Amino acid sequence: GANPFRPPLAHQGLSKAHVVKTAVSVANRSAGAEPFVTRNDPRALAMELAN
Amino acid sequence: VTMSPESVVAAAGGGNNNSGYNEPQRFALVVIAVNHNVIRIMNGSMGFPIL
Secondary structure, eight states, X not given: OOOOSOOOOOOSOOOOOOOSSOXXXXXXXXOOOTTSOOOXXXXXXXXXXXX | OOOOHHHHHHHSOOOXXXXXXXXXXXXXXXXXXXXXXXXXXXXXXXXXXXX
16 A cells, blocks of 8 residues: 555654634833932932021 | 532431431532544644644
């Protein structure tokens, strides 16, 4: 039948076109930035009383 | 799933002889499902295109 079983030729494989289960998309949540409420107390200022 | 009073009473033992629930009874829930799939035969090979 021209159908031998010996050849280990396992082809190339199979292309996974899609996945059975879709991947949900979560909302991106960043974090602190340059003015991320930090303590530095350089000046402490001086508020003169007007009256 | 909501169980039944017969199951509730059969869970506790103490049944008389030839009643089946002489000893405490334990139950387990089993669920199976049946689904479709697609198989592609090419290059003398096989596999699920959608996986």
